[PDB]
């Protein structure tokens, strides 16, 4: 037993990380088959990114201006197009240790693993959630652009996030692997602020189920609630409502632990209206909400990917 913030095995993605250098700017690229994906601000200098000209700076760059480098080997760029905020650099050699992969645009609440890279080398891996304001509580330094967030599905690596920038508040914004930002954010060093965002209710409930599996069950009560009377309370507390779907996603955890979904909702309701009474659940003094129902299943059932 024991329940930790657990990330996917990164081996399949690590083989795809390459260094992309344009001028003096050096940041990471994702090498899948014969195409390299990277933030489009690899072409920017220090001077022109308070408000950058992305299609003039792209004109003056040719294929040879781009160093794509996989470890000890250089990759020949044979073509470059710009789709939204990502560059697609076509290289002459298909990555040999490209995995089964697909591109997904996630919805707020879904959790992915971030392979934090610098200078084309993977540095660290950790789990993040897609907050409803389309930001991520991440940990990136300058040079982390190009790092990708991913999930592992049916031996198929779902690429869902590429890191681009840090908002002034400390949170981070990025794009999907097709170049469209998540949220209203734009790749520029201007005043941008994260919007109001909600505590992912279905993920708190999945976390509560994982605590009961691990033996934390002091918050269980005699009481049940209705779905919508629970929704009431969740409304006022920046918890966003529980749909019938959310009840259906939580079903498997419910069937495993034998506790009805509305029984947790009663326990969660006066976790909100009372506070945790100084006690901790799974080692946290907060209500942690970065665990999707699959995240709990895969960590508690011992699901492996290989």
């Amino acid at each position: 037993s024991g329940f930790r913030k657990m990330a996917f095995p990164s081996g399949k993605v690590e083989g795809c990380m390459v260094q992309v250098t344009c001028g003096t700017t050096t940041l990471n690229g994702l090498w899948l088959d014969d195409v390299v994906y990277c933030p489009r601000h690899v072409i920017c200098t220090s001077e022109d990114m308070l408000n950058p000209n992305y299609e003039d700076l792209l004109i003056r760059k040719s294929n040879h201006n781009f160093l794509v480098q996989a470890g000890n080997v250089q990759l020949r760029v044979i073509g470059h197009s710009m789709q939204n905020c990502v560059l697609k650099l076509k290289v002459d050699t298909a990555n040999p240790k490209t995995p089964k992969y697909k591109f997904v645009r996630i919805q707020p609440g879904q959790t992915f693993s971030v392979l934090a890279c610098y200078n084309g080398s993977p540095s660290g891996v950790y789990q993040c959630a897609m907050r409803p304001n389309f930001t991520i509580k991440g940990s990136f330094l300058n040079g982390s652009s190009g790092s990708v967030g991913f999930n592992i599905d049916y031996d198929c690596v779902s690429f869902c996030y590429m890191h681009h920038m840090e908002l002034p508040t400390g949170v981070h914004a990025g794009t999907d692997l097709e170049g469209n930002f998540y949220g209203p954010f734009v790749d520029r060093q201007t005043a941008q602020a994260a919007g109001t965002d909600t505590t992912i209710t279905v993920n708190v409930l999945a976390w509560l189920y994982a605590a009961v599996i691990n033996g934390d069950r002091w918050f269980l009560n005699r009481f049940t609630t209705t779905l919508n009377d629970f929704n009431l309370v969740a409304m006022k507390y920046n918890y966003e409502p529980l749909t019938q779907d959310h009840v259906d996603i939580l079903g498997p955890l419910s069937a495993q632990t034998g506790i009805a979904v509305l029984d947790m909702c009663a326990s969660l309701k006066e976790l909100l209206q009372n506070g945790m009474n100084g006690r901790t659940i799974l080692g946290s003094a907060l209500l942690e909400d970065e665990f999707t129902p699959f995240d709990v299943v895969r960590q508690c059932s011992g699901v492996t990917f290989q």
């Binding site: 990114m49 982390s144 652009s145 890191h163 681009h164 840090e166 914004a173 201007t190």
Partner: peptide
Amino acid sequence: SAVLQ
């Protein structure tokens, strides 16, 4: 002032 990383 966002930071491009």
